[PDB]
């Protein structure tokens, strides 16, 4: 199928933006330990919002591209609108780029003023720092996309893969609506904030990744459609079942009733399950091949992604999801550690899993690259992957050291924020190091093209 | 055990839990005016919240333990800076003296805030600090 041609820009643009994310992560990582680095010009809070908004946005481009590609194979027909796919690309790229720039080129508050935040306040919330106009831009682009791709599954086959990925996307769009809801009451604010972040990341995205993964197994393997989709259904079932009440894990210390400590810890315990079964899925349907597949780089990506998703979201999430542990660890380098591996492990990795699949057969090259461009990919796989397990280790080491020095002693013996921060330097230095390894590993993954 | 019985577990399994969650969030919202002490949520504090969002403090600090890990928890900062009585006065000073300029220290920008805006910020923080937070953070340091 031809009009899968549209999926390229989205990937390519996504790769660029993700280079951006790293440099800014690298700035922050330096600012930790050289605390005035690039101050006043680029304060920590600006670098962060660039780092974290480039993450969200690039992953979206990945997702979309992914949809634009696999849907038409699944749907058995050409995509509804290539022109809408191309137009949207530019709107959404223009919007991402313009808003990152606002962050850099104007002090946040003046940017508030400038975009008339005054009218309908939505800025200044973690991951929701974009002006109310950029949010709406993001919304419009999303709705057009659902239309373009959703229209493609009304006419045409309905696989379970497409159905499930479609549910995936629609939910992502709808929940993103709560970003326009900014309650005057602080605890009510945080309460609904989590309906975006967590309902995204432990619920509705899981559908998007599962479906993306299920697709790649099907094609990469030959294994029967009926078992993959049966499995695909099992995994989301466990995701939704554990994840919806699970949002309780974010509900311990914010103002909402105590019963959340119980509900949240109980259901949270179950949340690694989808991810484990995701590793089972991975190995077992890429255990029993109807054919050896030219690209063993997709295989790897597919396994790695499930494995990493499980260590990061699965294992690291459990470590600190029970209330009595969370009580001390909440809002700590342990939080940074989990956030990193899990986002990398599930969502970064899956985006590249598909890229490795779609890309060759998109520049019309073939089902894989020349062995030169294959061993590069695998090197880039291993540098980035290893680097991240390193990044999270140093971060955990620093988290645990923070909890010991600041959280556990009583008043008077607990060390101040800024002073325990200084003891942690060595870890942050090593963290920068792993961060450098990563960039190099991205650059390799890139030069595989 | 086939794909159908798998798919329904998903359908109903998630309809049950969505409604259950919507129920509890209904229940939660009716305790909030007691827990967060909305009776004491003044024009001052709602405005303070605005000042907070518009300057992106959460881009560096944590509030009630969510936010950024660069800089201290402000959720309980009242307690650790002369508390109820003199906090407003402190925060007035705190904001005009940034950045401190100790070499190599992490720095806080100068926001050029009005004495009105700072005074709002203070009530917002003072009020934030009295939310029933299930006894979090563990201690004075936050």
């Amino acid at each position: 199928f031809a009009s899968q041609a549209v999926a390229k820009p989205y990937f390519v643009f996504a790769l660029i933006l993700f280079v951006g994310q790293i440099l800014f992560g690298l700035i922050m990582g330096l600012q930790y330990v050289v605390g005035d680095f690039l101050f006043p010009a680029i304060p920590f809070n600006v670098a962060r919002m660039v780092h974290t908004n480039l993450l969200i946005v690039w992953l979206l481009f990945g997702f979309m591209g992914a949809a634009y590609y696999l849907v038409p194979e699944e749907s058995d027909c050409e995509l509804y609108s290539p022109k809408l796919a191309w137009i949207l690309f530019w709107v959404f790229a223009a919007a991402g780029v313009l808003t990152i720039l606002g962050y850099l080129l104007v002090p946040y508050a003046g940017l508030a003023r400038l975009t008339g935040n005054e009218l309908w306040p939505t800025m200044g919330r973690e991951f929701l720092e974009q002006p109310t106009i950029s949010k709406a831009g993001i919304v419009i682009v999303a709705l057009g996309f659902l239309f373009n791709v959703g229209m493609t599954v009304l006419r045409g086959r309905k696989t379970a893969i497409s159905m499930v990925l479609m549910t995936g996307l629609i939910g992502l769009a709808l929940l993103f609506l709560f970003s326009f809801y900014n309650p005057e009451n602080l605890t009510r604010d945080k309460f609904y904030w989590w309906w975006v972040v967590h309902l995204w990341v432990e619920g509705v995205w899981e559908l998007i990744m599962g479906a993306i993964l299920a697709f790649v197994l099907v094609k990469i393997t030959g294994v029967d459609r009926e078992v993959i989709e049966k499995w695909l259904y099992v995994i989301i079932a466990m995701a939704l079942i554990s994840g919806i009440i699970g949002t309780g894990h974010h509900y311990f210390w914010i103002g909402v009733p105590g019963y959340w400590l119980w509900l949240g810890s109980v259901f949270s315990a179950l949340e690694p399950l989808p991810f484990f079964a995701m590793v089972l899925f991975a190995f077992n349907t890429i255990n029993r091949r109807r054919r050896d597949y030219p690209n063993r780089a997709v295989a790897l990506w597919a396994m790695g992604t499930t494995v990493m998703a499980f260590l990061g979201a699965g294992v690291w999430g459990f470590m600190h999801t029970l209330a009595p542990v969370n009580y001390y660890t909440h809002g700590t380098q342990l939080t940074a550690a989990h956030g990193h591996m899990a986002f990398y492990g599930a969502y970064a990795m899956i985006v590249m899993t598909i890229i490795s699949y779609a890309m060759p057969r998109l520049r019309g090259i073939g089902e894989a690259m020349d062995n030169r461009s294959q061993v590069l990919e695998m090197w880039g796989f291993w540098l980035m992957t290893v680097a991240m397990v390193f990044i999270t280790l140093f971060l955990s080491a620093a988290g645990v050291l923070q909890v010991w020095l600041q959280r556990m002693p009583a008043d008077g013996a607990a060390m101040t924020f800024m002073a325990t921060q200084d003891q942690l330097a060595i870890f942050y230095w090593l963290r920068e190091g792993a961060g450098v390894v990563f960039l190099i590993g991205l650059v390799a993954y890139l030069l595989s093209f | 055990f086939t794909k159908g019985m798998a798919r329904n577990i998903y359908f109903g399994g998630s309809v049950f839990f969505i409604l259950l969650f919507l129920a509890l969030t209904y229940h939660t919202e009716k305790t909030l005016p007691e827990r967060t002490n909305e009776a004491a949520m003044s024009a001052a504090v709602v405005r303070g919240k605005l000042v907070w969002e518009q300057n992106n403090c959460v881009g560096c600090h944590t509030l009630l333990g969510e936010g950024a890990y660069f800089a201290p928890e402000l959720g309980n900062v009242v307690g650790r800076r002369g508390g109820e009585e003199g906090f407003n006065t402190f925060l007035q000073a705190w904001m005009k003296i940034q950045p401190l300029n100790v070499p190599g220290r992490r720095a806080m920008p100068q926001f050029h805030l009005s004495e009105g805006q700072v005074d709002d910020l203070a009530e917002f923080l003072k009020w934030s600090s009295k939310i029933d937070t299930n006894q979090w953070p563990p201690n004075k340091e936050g």
Partner: antibody
Amino acid sequence: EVQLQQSGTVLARPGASVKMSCKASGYSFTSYWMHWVKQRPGQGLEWIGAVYPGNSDTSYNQKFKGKAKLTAVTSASTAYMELSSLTNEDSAVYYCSRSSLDGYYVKNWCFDVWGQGTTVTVSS
Amino acid sequence: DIQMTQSPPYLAASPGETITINCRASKSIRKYLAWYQEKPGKTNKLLIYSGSTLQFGIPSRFSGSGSGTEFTLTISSLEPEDFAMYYCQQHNEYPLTFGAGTKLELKR
């Protein structure tokens, strides 16, 4: 309230040794440099040195590298200074004080609270 | 080592008047000068650090200014309790060093 409480007057003979203390209360002892300052009558303040009770490191003014030894005991929130081989030039008031900012890398900052001073008189 | 000399050694003034005192450094210390007040039977008290930043709690009647090498503290409308000894402290370099002080006496 941040307070430093210093020990009473000590009297020594020349060549002898003396150990005075500074008891910190009202803040996180382990998070600030504790500094020590010397003052003799009509004679201007001199920075002796500092200890950081969070990791026990010290820093001495090169002029007091023989004279003085700073240590700290974290469970009692107290810091100590031992002066040695007392000379008549060591009769003076000695202050402890607390760096006005917390952390290990603010080594050379100004102070925000002082002890009241402990007198040392050296005489035969 | 960098050496501080304050001037004048002593100064007489009356309540309600303005006085201003000087602190010079042997070499550049950028902005990092602090001032303390000493009174009999009280602990030394930080007034200004970083050349011009008022410490928490100190009334604004006090102020200071300078960089590099030459610094001043000013009191705006002297008050009865302002008659005290004032010391300056450089906080740019190890070792910390102090001026020998200025005595601000009450005229009669």
